[PDB]
Every structure is written in structure tokens, then in C-alpha cells.
Design a protein around this motif. Structure first.
Motif, mmCIF file in Angstrom:
data_model
loop_
_atom_site.group_PDB
_atom_site.id
_atom_site.type_symbol
_atom_site.label_atom_id
_atom_site.label_comp_id
_atom_site.label_asym_id
_atom_site.label_seq_id
_atom_site.Cartn_x
_atom_site.Cartn_y
_atom_site.Cartn_z
ATOM 1 N N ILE A 94 -3.152 -9.453 -4.505
ATOM 2 C CA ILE A 94 -4.025 -9.266 -5.657
ATOM 3 C C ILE A 94 -3.241 -9.394 -6.955
ATOM 4 O O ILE A 94 -2.080 -8.979 -7.035
ATOM 5 C CB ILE A 94 -4.721 -7.886 -5.627
ATOM 6 C CG1 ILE A 94 -5.167 -7.539 -4.207
ATOM 7 C CG2 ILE A 94 -5.915 -7.866 -6.572
ATOM 8 C CD1 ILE A 94 -4.195 -6.644 -3.470
ATOM 9 N N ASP A 123 -3.145 -2.128 -8.468
ATOM 10 C CA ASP A 123 -3.339 -3.323 -9.291
ATOM 11 C C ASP A 123 -4.088 -2.987 -10.572
ATOM 12 O O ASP A 123 -3.619 -3.273 -11.675
ATOM 13 C CB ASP A 123 -4.092 -4.411 -8.524
ATOM 14 C CG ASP A 123 -4.026 -5.756 -9.229
ATOM 15 O OD1 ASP A 123 -2.963 -6.413 -9.156
ATOM 16 O OD2 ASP A 123 -5.028 -6.152 -9.861
ATOM 17 N N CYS A 124 -5.239 -2.367 -10.422
ATOM 18 C CA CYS A 124 -6.051 -1.995 -11.561
ATOM 19 C C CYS A 124 -5.971 -0.487 -11.787
ATOM 20 O O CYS A 124 -6.510 0.302 -11.007
ATOM 21 C CB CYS A 124 -7.486 -2.448 -11.326
ATOM 22 S SG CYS A 124 -7.604 -3.901 -10.251
ATOM 23 N N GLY A 144 -6.954 -7.946 -10.706
ATOM 24 C CA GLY A 144 -8.275 -7.705 -10.150
ATOM 25 C C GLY A 144 -8.855 -8.921 -9.456
ATOM 26 O O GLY A 144 -10.076 -9.053 -9.324
ATOM 27 N N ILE A 168 -11.311 -4.905 -7.536
ATOM 28 C CA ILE A 168 -10.263 -3.925 -7.751
ATOM 29 C C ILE A 168 -9.546 -3.555 -6.459
ATOM 30 O O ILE A 168 -10.170 -3.397 -5.408
ATOM 31 C CB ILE A 168 -10.824 -2.641 -8.395
ATOM 32 C CG1 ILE A 168 -11.676 -2.975 -9.626
ATOM 33 C CG2 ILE A 168 -9.696 -1.692 -8.766
ATOM 34 C CD1 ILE A 168 -10.977 -3.841 -10.655
ATOM 35 N N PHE A 169 -8.226 -3.446 -6.552
ATOM 36 C CA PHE A 169 -7.391 -3.056 -5.429
ATOM 37 C C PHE A 169 -6.377 -2.000 -5.881
ATOM 38 O O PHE A 169 -6.016 -1.952 -7.060
ATOM 39 C CB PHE A 169 -6.674 -4.270 -4.844
ATOM 40 C CG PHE A 169 -7.423 -4.927 -3.716
ATOM 41 C CD1 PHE A 169 -7.260 -4.493 -2.410
ATOM 42 C CD2 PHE A 169 -8.287 -5.980 -3.963
ATOM 43 C CE1 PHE A 169 -7.945 -5.096 -1.372
ATOM 44 C CE2 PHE A 169 -8.973 -6.586 -2.928
ATOM 45 C CZ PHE A 169 -8.802 -6.143 -1.632
ATOM 46 N N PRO A 170 -5.922 -1.141 -4.950
ATOM 47 C CA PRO A 170 -4.957 -0.066 -5.232
ATOM 48 C C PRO A 170 -3.745 -0.498 -6.055
ATOM 49 O O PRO A 170 -3.130 -1.536 -5.791
ATOM 50 C CB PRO A 170 -4.509 0.372 -3.839
ATOM 51 C CG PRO A 170 -5.673 0.079 -2.961
ATOM 52 C CD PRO A 170 -6.335 -1.143 -3.534
ATOM 53 N N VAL A 183 -2.113 -5.750 -0.135
ATOM 54 C CA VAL A 183 -2.912 -4.753 0.553
ATOM 55 C C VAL A 183 -3.336 -5.265 1.924
ATOM 56 O O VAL A 183 -3.859 -6.374 2.049
ATOM 57 C CB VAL A 183 -4.156 -4.363 -0.278
ATOM 58 C CG1 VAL A 183 -5.140 -3.538 0.542
ATOM 59 C CG2 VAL A 183 -3.731 -3.608 -1.528
ATOM 60 N N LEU A 202 0.823 -1.212 0.000
ATOM 61 C CA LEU A 202 0.000 0.000 0.000
ATOM 62 C C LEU A 202 0.857 1.262 0.000
ATOM 63 O O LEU A 202 0.434 2.311 -0.489
ATOM 64 C CB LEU A 202 -0.922 0.024 1.220
ATOM 65 C CG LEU A 202 -2.153 -0.880 1.138
ATOM 66 C CD1 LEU A 202 -2.768 -1.055 2.518
ATOM 67 C CD2 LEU A 202 -3.172 -0.299 0.169
ATOM 68 N N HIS A 237 0.522 -7.499 -5.796
ATOM 69 C CA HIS A 237 0.078 -6.418 -4.932
ATOM 70 C C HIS A 237 -0.326 -6.939 -3.567
ATOM 71 O O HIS A 237 -1.054 -7.921 -3.460
ATOM 72 C CB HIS A 237 -1.072 -5.659 -5.591
ATOM 73 C CG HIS A 237 -0.611 -4.841 -6.754
ATOM 74 N ND1 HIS A 237 -0.867 -5.171 -8.069
ATOM 75 C CD2 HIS A 237 0.144 -3.722 -6.792
ATOM 76 C CE1 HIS A 237 -0.278 -4.294 -8.859
ATOM 77 N NE2 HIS A 237 0.340 -3.400 -8.108
#
Lengths: 76, 109
Positions: A44, B58-59, A47, B54-56, A70, A8, A68
Motif C-alpha cells: 500500500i 499507511d493512513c 491509501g 486505508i491500510f494499517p 499487509v 503488519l 506498507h
């Protein structure tokens, strides 16, 4: 192979993994470097959240891919 | 929902991006599950076709500057090499980027 896990904070954590490595193991590896509990770790890719009972090959995660991470901040 | 506007989607037919002709809408359902649901619902049958998480970072939702129309937007995934194309069905462009901005905000938060 090496992968790039962006957190993040935008931190790109380079992790050493193999296609046959399970996502749950990846979380454990991240917990070694960062120390963040895997239970709050959310990976992630395209998506879609990575399930612990899956491998990198399942998500077609190739070499030098961007993952990713988070953290779920439910309390605030 | 947080963001809900009329926009058509496109499908990758083989190797060529083919835009849809159905009148659908793009809505972002931010559930308490912390999953930013970016879904596309058709207004004709009321059927939800697309529904992603959707995540920060990433998309990455962005507009295509290489388009004469300028109403073409694309959801570029930094992972999986996935790219979803959409076109604003808005009569005016006075809220085109505005919609995108609101979308990006919700997608990353």
C-alpha cells in the motif's frame, strides 16, 4: 535506491529497488528475504494498493519512501 | 457502515487548504475484500466524492492540535505525502476524539 517497507508487525524492511522496477518484482524480492508468497502480499502507498503491473515511478515512489506490506488473513 | 458521522472535508486549492461548506458525512465501509474504504459522502446530493483504501500504519488519522477550533482532523498518509483535512460537524466535542479513535481502529483493523 533503498525503500522502507513496513509490515503488519511494524517491521521496517529495507529493500533495494529502482524507480523502473515493477511492483511484482518487489514482491519477489520480499519473498526472498521473508519468504511470504507474493499472492498474499499487499503493498500500500498513499491509501492505494500497488498493482503488480506498475512501476515505482507510477506511484511516484521516491528514494527512502515508506511502503506498507499487509498480509491478507482471510482464514481465521 | 462501521463508522458514520457528519464532518466536512477540505480541498487543497493550489497551495492553500480550503474547507468545504457542503454538509457531508464520513463513513467507513469495511468490505470483505479487506479494503478499509474511507469515503466521504455529501448529504445534499447524496454523492460519494472521496473513496480510498486505508491500510494499517499507511493512513494515520490524527487531530490538529495547532487549531483554535479543535474540530480539525487530518488523515496523514505516511506514504505519498497525502494529507486530507476534515472538520467534525458534531454539536458537542464529547465524542470528537471518540469518533477519531473508532476511525483509527477500523483503519488499522
Amino acid at each position: 535506491m533503498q525503500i522502507f517497507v513496513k509490515t503488519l508487525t511494524g517491521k521496517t524492511i529495507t529493500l533495494e529497488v529502482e524507480p523502473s522496477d515493477t511492483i511484482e518484482n518487489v514482491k519477489a524480492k520480499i519473498q526472498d528475504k521473508e519468504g511470504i508468497p507474493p499472492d498474499q502480499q499487499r503493498l500500500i502507498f498513499a491509501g492505494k494498493q500497488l498493482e503488480d503491473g506498475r512501476t515505482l515511478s507510477d506511484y511516484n515512489i521516491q528514494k527512502e519512501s515508506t511502503l506498507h506490506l499487509v498480509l491478507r488473513l482471510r482464514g481465521g | 457502515y462501521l463508522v458514520e458521522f457528519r464532518a466536512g472535508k477540505m480541498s487543497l486549492k493550489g497551495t492553500t487548504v480550503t474547507p468545504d461548506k457542503r454538509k457531508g458525512l464520513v463513513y467507513i465501509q469495511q468490505t470483505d475484500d479487506s479494503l478499509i474504504h474511507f469515503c466521504w459522502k455529501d448529504r445534499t446530493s447524496g454523492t460519494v466524492e472521496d473513496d480510498l483504501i486505508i491500510f494499517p500504519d499507511d493512513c494515520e488519522f490524527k487531530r490538529v492540535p495547532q487549531c483554535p477550533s479543535g474540530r480539525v482532523y487530518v488523515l496523514k498518509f505516511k506514504a505519498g505525502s497525502k494529507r486530507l483535512f476534515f472538520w467534525m460537524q458534531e454539536p458537542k466535542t464529547d465524542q470528537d476524539e471518540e469518533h477519531c479513535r473508532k476511525v483509527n481502529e477500523c483503519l488499522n483493523n
